[PDB]
């Protein structure tokens, strides 16, 4: 068989991702949250979709069509920029910080799991920047945080913290050690 240039490059990059010995601040990724806990994290995170551009436009025209002719609490949503998440973390305004494992330059998000372990922020490296993108009206998100919450979802969030602490942080205490990628 004969493949294209770019196909050969991404296949070569795939086998290069495995066969090299890798520094332990990377490969701290790919030791990621399993299927049940990931689905359960999103069962909470899907309840806080940031109000999409169409929804925001129609509502704020509803404000105009009503209020100009003839009280609300602050609404809660997931928080999704890297400047803003690393702002929220270190201010301790973060209760659950979700980090993508696949980022275009890897160097972007390498400090973040260990800065979360430093601040005492209960983090989870979840699989897919696309999968984080879906819950946030963006193609990709790299990071998603949950600062404040409705009280109906509060107990579920606190348990999501404790499940992620037990499932992720306790199973992967060896991941701060051990250079990954020694696969023969």
């Amino acid at each position: 068989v004969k493949w294209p240039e770019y196909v050969r490059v991404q296949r070569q990059k795939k086998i290069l991702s495995i066969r090299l010995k890798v520094p332990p601040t990377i490969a701290q990724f790919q030791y990621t949250l399993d299927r049940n806990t990931a689905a359960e994290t999103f069962k909470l995170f899907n309840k806080y979709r940031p109000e999409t551009a169409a929804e925001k436009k129609e509502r704020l025209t509803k404000e105009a069509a009503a209020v100009a002719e003839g009280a609300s609490p602050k609404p809660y949503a997931v928080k999704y920029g890297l400047n803003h998440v690393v702002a929220l973390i270190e201010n301790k305004k973060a209760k659950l910080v979700l980090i993508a494992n696949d980022v275009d330059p890897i160097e972007l998000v390498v400090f973040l799991p260990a800065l979360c372990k430093k601040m005492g922020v209960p983090y989870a490296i979840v699989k897919g920047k696309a999968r984080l993108g879906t819950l946030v009206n963006q193609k990709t998100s790299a990071v998603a945080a949950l600062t404040e919450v409705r009280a109906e979802d509060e107990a579920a969030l606190a348990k999501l913290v404790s499940t992620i602490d037990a499932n992720f942080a306790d199973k992967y205490d060896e991941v701060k050690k051990h250079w990954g990628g020694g696969i023969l």
Binding site: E5, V9, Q12, K13, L16, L20, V22, P23, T25, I26, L82, N83, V85, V86, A87, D104, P105, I106, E107, L108, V110, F111, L115
Partner: protein, 186 residues
């Protein structure tokens, strides 16, 4: 913020994380073309402090140049970085070279990531912070050394040390080598 973490991360270049990053990417850039376009900056922090805004009209090109130059030390006293900037200036002749930075290096090749603005793009022609590049006095700034590295290689700065090249070495030579004669002879 987030870029201070990035800035101080890329100051450690032989550190084991960035050692590994640079090992993979040097090989990956060899497999591509010499001058090719980058999807997005590899170092968005350094891109941004050199003035890359991630908006329509802003381009990142990745470039490769050979290293080095007593026949093997017949010098060629222009930089590798200015050579790179000029090559991307010719392949992308509709753009204007804003700035460039170092990304990865090697025995044979030094790599750069030039940043380019589209002066014909309407998202650049408005917004009064970047529409200065549309003025035709910036047609090929990289060809006349008006970029950061060009102004370095010209030796343009302030002081005693740059007296021979403060207004440009050709200008100051021509000025100081002129028999100025007045109507009423001084």
């Amino acid at each position: 913020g987030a870029y201070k973490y990035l800035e101080e991360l890329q100051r450690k270049k032989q550190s084991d994380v960035l050692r590994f990053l640079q090992r993979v990417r040097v090989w990956e850039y060899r497999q591509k073309n010499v001058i090719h376009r980058a999807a997005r900056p590899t170092r968005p922090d350094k891109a941004r402090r050199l003035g890359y805004k991630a908006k329509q009209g802003f381009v990142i090109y990745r470039v490769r140049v050979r290293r080095g130059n007593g026949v093997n030390e017949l010098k060629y006293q222009r930089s590798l970085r200015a050579t790179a900037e000029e090559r991307v200036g010719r392949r992308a002749a509709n753009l204007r070279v804003l700035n460039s930075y170092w990304v990865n290096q090697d025995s044979t090749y030094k790599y750069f990531e030039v940043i380019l603005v589209d002066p014909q793009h309407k998202a650049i022609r408005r917004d009064a912070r970047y529409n200065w590049i549309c003025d035709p006095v910036h047609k090929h700034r990289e060809a006349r050394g008006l970029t950061a590295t060009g102004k370095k290689s010209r030796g343009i700065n302030k002081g005693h040390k740059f007296n021979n090249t403060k207004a440009g070495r050709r200008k100051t030579w021509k000025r100081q080598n002129t028999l100025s004669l007045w109507r009423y002879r001084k």
